[PDB]
């Protein structure tokens, strides 16, 4: 009588407790600074906040019963202890006999892992509490939270294909838009790096959270560009110039991404370097093909931020904003190209 997704989570948590295993308590106990009490305090704070929001009525979502909330929390707590054990056991420092107190005292990792097991539980039950509900409830920055997703996918092989597709989809939402909002910690991370945005070469082939973030952003955008170039039959040499213009906007025009969407910058890189190299495709041509992409929805080309608060279509943005900021770069192709990923 249980859904496939719900039956899978109860298989993964079968006969495990919402407590650390003796193996995890061993690893905790090997540390100069045993982290067990601060992990339990993090899980209780997240638990209280989750239960308060779940049970509180808004007009966007009627609230639900405490009994359901505690069930979801306990299942997420069992998922947390199980995945944390797999991560910590497979850490190279553990295998080399090295104190792991610094790795286990990163609050942002524990909060991110627990929020991600809450997301797995709520998705399995088809909850209306849609990402980004969990990270908004728990005050988690998308720019920090996203890194956990791949750790969870490679750490928990019991996850169904639907669960992994859900987690991959939330990862892309963050890379495409959420991490670029005006109060994203991404801007803080850029600021401390003297606002030097990593280039494709420095990350596809330096290190740190900014480096990881942009390497996932370059990966996601390269894949989306390949499909648009194939559905419009364009030269592989125009693709490399579009990629180089895209990279120019991410590295030298980073402000253009703030409160916007990756795809909006990719399409206007398509148009301006289509035109300058004379391999012309109309902006209507570019857009129709884009609509067939899974992440695409009309708002990406119909509701584009112009001032900060007026909104307009992508063509309006291109003419009012994009062409002035980028024409000096693109007209160098009317030359150095950039490494296109895979």
């Amino acid at each position: 009588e249980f859904t496939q997704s719900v039956s899978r989570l109860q298989s993964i948590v079968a006969g495990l407790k919402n407590a650390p295993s003796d193996q995890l308590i061993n690893i905790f106990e090997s540390c100069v600074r045993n982290p067990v009490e601060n992990i339990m305090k993090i899980l209780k704070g997240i638990g209280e906040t989750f239960c308060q929001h779940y049970t509180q009525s808004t007009d966007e979502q009627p609230g639900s019963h405490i009994d359901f909330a505690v069930n979801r929390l306990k299942l997420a707590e069992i998922l947390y202890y199980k995945i944390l054990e797999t991560v910590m056991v497979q850490e190279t420092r553990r295998l080399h006999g090295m104190d792991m107190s610094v790795l286990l005292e990163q609050d942002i990792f524990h909060r991110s892992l627990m929020a991600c097991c809450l997301e797995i539980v709520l998705f399995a039950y088809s909850s209306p509490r849609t990402f980004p509900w969990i990270i908004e409830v728990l005050n988690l920055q998308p720019f920090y939270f996203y890194k956990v997703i791949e750790v969870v996918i490679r750490s928990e092989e019991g996850l169904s294909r639907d669960m992994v597709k859900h987690l991959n989809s939330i990862e892309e939402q963050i890379l495409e838009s959420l991490a670029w909002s005006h109060d994203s910690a991404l801007w803080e991370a850029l600021q401390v790096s003297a606002n030097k945005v990593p280039t494709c070469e420095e990350v596809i082939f330096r290190t740190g959270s900014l480096a990881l973030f942009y390497r996932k952003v370059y990966h996601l955008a390269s894949v989306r560009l390949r499909d648009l170039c194939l559905k419009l039959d364009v030269s592989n040499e125009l693709r490399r110039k579009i990629w180089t213009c895209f990279e120019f906007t991410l590295v030298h025009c980073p402000d253009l991404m703030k409160d916007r969407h990756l795809d909006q910058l990719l399409l206007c890189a398509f148009y301006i370097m289509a035109k300058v190299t004379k391999e012309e495709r109309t902006f209507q041509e570019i857009m129709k093909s884009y609509r067939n992409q899974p992440q695409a929805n009309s708002h990406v080309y119909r509701s584009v931020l112009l001032k900060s608060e007026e909104r307009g279509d992508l063509i309006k943005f291109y003419n009012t904003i994009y062409v002035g900021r980028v024409k000096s770069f693109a007209l160098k192709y009317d030359p150095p190209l950039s490494p296109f990923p895979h």
Binding site: K275, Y318, L331
Partner: peptide, 14 residues
Amino acid sequence: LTEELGCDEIIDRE
């Protein structure tokens, strides 16, 4: 003077 790179196309299905 005109700027060529500008786009003079339009769309409004909505």
